[PDB]
């Protein structure tokens, strides 16, 4: 296990050998084997997408190209989307088309495989061969970093929907005045 | 008594009594709430 979520407790029996398992299942969602066998792959994929998303949200702002929210504004407004500074002359419809074609073929190729190959495909997805050499610890690494990134992406969306600022802008506004610039101070999150 | 109440339960008397009660009730309703053409609530 390594973890107990609630320090004292009794944890679900089916959660024991999984990578980065803390017995977190008070709802009994993965009790049957098939539900858990699907939810593991769903969580890993969710974590990878989150890690990449959080990387993008930090990178689009830390380097100096704007928010993670204003990203799609130059898509309408007449036209013209910016990527590092290029024009990428591609209207809205062709973006949806090209991305739909790419994600359809990719997601229809990665899923049509066996359950283990659906989440942990060695093949060319381990070019540096770190898939071997005791991959349980590395799987724990991946899953925990993915959980952190999921919460990070959720926080990005929520703090934008509350204060309207930006990750780095919100961080700066908090660090300047930790005292009256919290979630408790904007009259959205904490109401009382 | 028992036979008198049995007589009061006969169809000729109980029917007439119930018609009298319902008629009286409609007459009272129309006396207090007259000229009601629609179900105005």
């Amino acid at each position: 296990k390594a973890g107990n979520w609630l320090p004292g407790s009794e944890t679900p029996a089916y959660l024991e050998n999984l990578p980065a398992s803390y017995g977190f299942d008070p709802l009994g969602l993965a009790a049957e084997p098939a539900s858990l066998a699907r939810f593991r792959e769903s969580e890993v994929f969710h974590g990878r997408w989150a890690m990449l998303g959080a990387a993008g949200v930090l990178g689009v702002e830390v380097l100096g190209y704007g928010n993670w929210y204003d990203a799609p504004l130059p898509l309408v407004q007449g036209g013209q989307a910016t990527y590092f500074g290029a024009s990428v002359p591609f209207d809205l419809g062709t973006l949806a088309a090209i991305e739909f074609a790419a994600m359809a073929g990719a997601e229809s190729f990665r899923g049509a495989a066996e359950p283990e190959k659906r989440v942990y495909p060695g093949g060319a997805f381990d070019p540096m061969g770190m898939s071997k050499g005791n991959s349980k610890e590395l799987k724990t690494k991946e899953i925990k970093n993915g959980r952190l990134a999921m919460l990070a992406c959720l926080g990005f969306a929520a703090q934008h929907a509350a204060t309207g600022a930006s990750p780095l802008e919100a961080l700066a506004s908090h660090l300047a005045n930790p005292m009256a610039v919290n979630f408790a101070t904007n009259g959205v999150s904490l109401p009382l | 008594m028992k036979d008198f109440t049995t007589y009061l339960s006969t169809a000729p008397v109980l029917t007439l009594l119930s018609v009298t009660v319902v008629a009286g009730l409609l007459i009272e309703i129309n006396r207090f709430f007259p000229d009601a053409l629609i179900a105005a609530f």
Partner: protein, 165 residues
């Protein structure tokens, strides 16, 4: 307006009818001392007539070419025009009370059928039982829909006698 019928509170013929009927009663008044029993009766009648004509105008009934209130008997074309109290609401009210009486009678029949002399318990009604069933009949929509969804409301025709074709 729903079909060329202006609200009676606007129709001039409706107010004209009010006027004429009241004027007739006034002409009947002008013969008695306004403190005698006939005079009090006439004054009460006039007050009742005025109250009726004001009540009808308040509720927005529709008057025709003549000054007479009209009713609407189509749900939807009366519900989107504020005239559901004309036929739809009294429809519900009747259907309810009629079903109440019918269900009370039906259950009384089914209750006295399974007795010693069922032909006797129809000409000499059992008043406590009749009254109990009359009280239980108020929930007739619920009980009747229960018996239909149960299949116990009706009887299969293989058991009802029929004529020789």
């Amino acid at each position: 307006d729903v079909a060329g019928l202006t609200p009676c509170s606007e129709s001039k013929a409706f107010a004209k009818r009010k006027k004429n009927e009241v004027k007739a009663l006034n002409k009947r008044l002008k013969n008695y001392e306004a403190d005698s029993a006939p005079a009090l009766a006439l004054k009460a009648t006039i007050a009742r007539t005025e109250a009726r004509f004001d009540k009808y105008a308040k509720q927005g009934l529709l008057c025709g070419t003549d000054g007479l209130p009209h009713l609407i008997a189509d749900p939807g074309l009366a519900l989107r025009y504020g005239h559901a109290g004309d036929v739809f609401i009294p429809t519900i009210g009747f259907i309810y009370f009629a079903g109440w009486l019918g269900y009370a009678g039906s259950k009384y029949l089914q209750a006295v059928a399974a007795t010693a002399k069922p032909i006797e318990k129809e000409i000499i009604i059992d008043v406590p039982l009749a009254w109990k069933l009359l009280w239980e009949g108020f929930g007739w929509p619920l009980r009747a829909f229960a018996e239909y969804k149960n299949g116990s409301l009706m009887e299969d025709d293989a058991k009802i006698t029929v004529s020789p074709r």
